[PDB]
UniProtKB/Swiss-Prot annotation, chains A, B:
SUPFAM superfamilies from the UniProt entry: S-adenosyl-L-methionine-dependent methyltransferases
Gene label: N4OMT
Protein name (Swiss-Prot/TrEMBL): Norbelladine 4'-O-methyltransferase
Family: Belongs to the class I-like SAM-binding methyltransferase superfamily. Cation-dependent O-methyltransferase family.
Binding positions for a divalent metal cation per the UniProt entry: 158, 184-185
Amino acid sequence: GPGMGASIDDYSLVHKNILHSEDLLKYILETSAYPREHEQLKGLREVTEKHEWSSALVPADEGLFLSMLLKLMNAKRTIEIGVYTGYSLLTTALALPEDGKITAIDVNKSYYEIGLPFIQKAGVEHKINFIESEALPVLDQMLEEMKEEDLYDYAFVDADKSNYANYHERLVKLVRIGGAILYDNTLWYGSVAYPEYPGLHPEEEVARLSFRNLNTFLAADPRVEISQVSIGDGVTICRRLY
Amino acid sequence: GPGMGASIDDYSLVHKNILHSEDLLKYILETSAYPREHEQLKGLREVTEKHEWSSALVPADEGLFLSMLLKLMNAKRTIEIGVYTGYSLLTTALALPEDGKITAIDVNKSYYEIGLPFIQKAGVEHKINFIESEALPVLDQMLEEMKEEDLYDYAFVDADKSNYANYHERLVKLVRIGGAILYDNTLWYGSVAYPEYPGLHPEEEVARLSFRNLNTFLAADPRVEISQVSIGDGVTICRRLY
Ligand SMILES: Nc1ncnc2c1ncn2[C@@H]1O[C@H](CSCC[C@H](N)C(=O)O)[C@@H](O)[C@H]1O
Ligand SMILES: Nc1ncnc2c1ncn2[C@@H]1O[C@H](CSCC[C@H](N)C(=O)O)[C@@H](O)[C@H]1O
Ligand SMILES: Oc1ccc(CCNCc2ccc(O)c(O)c2)cc1
Ligand SMILES: [Mg+2]
Ligand SMILES: [Mg+2]
């Protein structure tokens, strides 16, 4: 993946999409997304489209959905897990109020520094505390240190696609009651629809199985209410109940 | 569409699915939606499935997406325009607190009485003020009475497609600043993605052009922020800015 492991040329799902045609997706982006996309988000996206791992980028229509959720729930304190070049991070920082705060975690800060000039020109870098690390030790460290009024309103999870289940067990204690946890890519290009699926590289197949297990688990998890949304590559919204 | 006498066999656009396969939609419904669907929503859905206009039903995955938005924004007072048998209305009523209030408007109360026994068994009928009328005169009258204490948190628009732009001009005054206005069917089975789309019923073509105009308008309307979400038949979330 982009963080470590296999090359991009080993991946086989990246050109698929969950909608029934590219024309419909293109219509959504040109009609409803790009006209509402901040100038620095446009610039960050255009640089990233030339990067080796452009396939991992959160798309522009999903970005506006993330922004809308953040504003409707009046989020102020958030955590971003899996930053890459920072498109979803810049989306979050633009949506939060002036005093919003973001904990952003990624194993590769060189990716983040690609998007940083656009984040700085947007004027919202002051909201971001970037941590270069594997996410799990940071999350475990945070659980030891966090007080009850330090809880997060919102978490966006978009990092190692086979470790979401481990992330979940921490985040249901790091996000406030009534707060939101969002898992990206829970439809995995449609490949979760079958128990067996042909021809995937091991990293892609392991992620596919991980999402099938996670999707079943989240639907049975009494600690949250859920909604799996067929936007982007599938986004599952979790709201903490207790 | 749904209206006494009208036959579904005269229409081309019936079963909603903009995903790339029936199996993918079935996966979402069976994995993430039906296990989280209230027993009275299940009962309402299953009796509606035998009705002539069962294809008008808001799908179960979209329903849980509406519920999640309502809870995340802590909505308390809402309006529902286009009720049919009451699936989205019961979804709203179950998501609101015990003392929440809904203004529900539909030209055909007989449809509502199909789902009413399930609304009653769910214990939320007391939240609902059902008005049997065309929605436009009701909204105009609402502009004459209510003030900011009576502004709505949330509006779901799912009635006669050619009147959405007219509904919008009232709802941007009836919903509070920061409140949400949602429009169902804004991708109209994918047919909005092209300038021309052969093979439609005349009323379906009027709706298709209405949505192409609406989608362009909403993307340009400075009074709201938007997110068009590729769920169900397309849902456009609008958030009132001022
Ligand atoms: N174990 C781990 N801990 C933290 N980040 C990880 C990780 N494994 C992979 N990652 C990072 O997760 C990212 C996934 S791509 C994330 C996309 C980004 N949210 C966007 O808006 O476009 C990569 O940058 C990768 O470096
Ligand atoms: N002018 C109008 N004013 C109010 N309702 C109207 C209308 N024209 C049509 N309708 C109603 O709009 C509905 C569309 S179907 C709505 C489905 C419903 N929201 C669900 O959850 O399944 C029909 O019940 C129809 O009677
Ligand atoms: O002017 C029209 C023309 C055709 C239709 C039928 C569309 N297919 C069923 C349907 C009906 C109403 C809905 O709200 C919905 O999502 C799905 C409706 C209104
Ligand atoms: Mg992703
Ligand atoms: Mg509809």
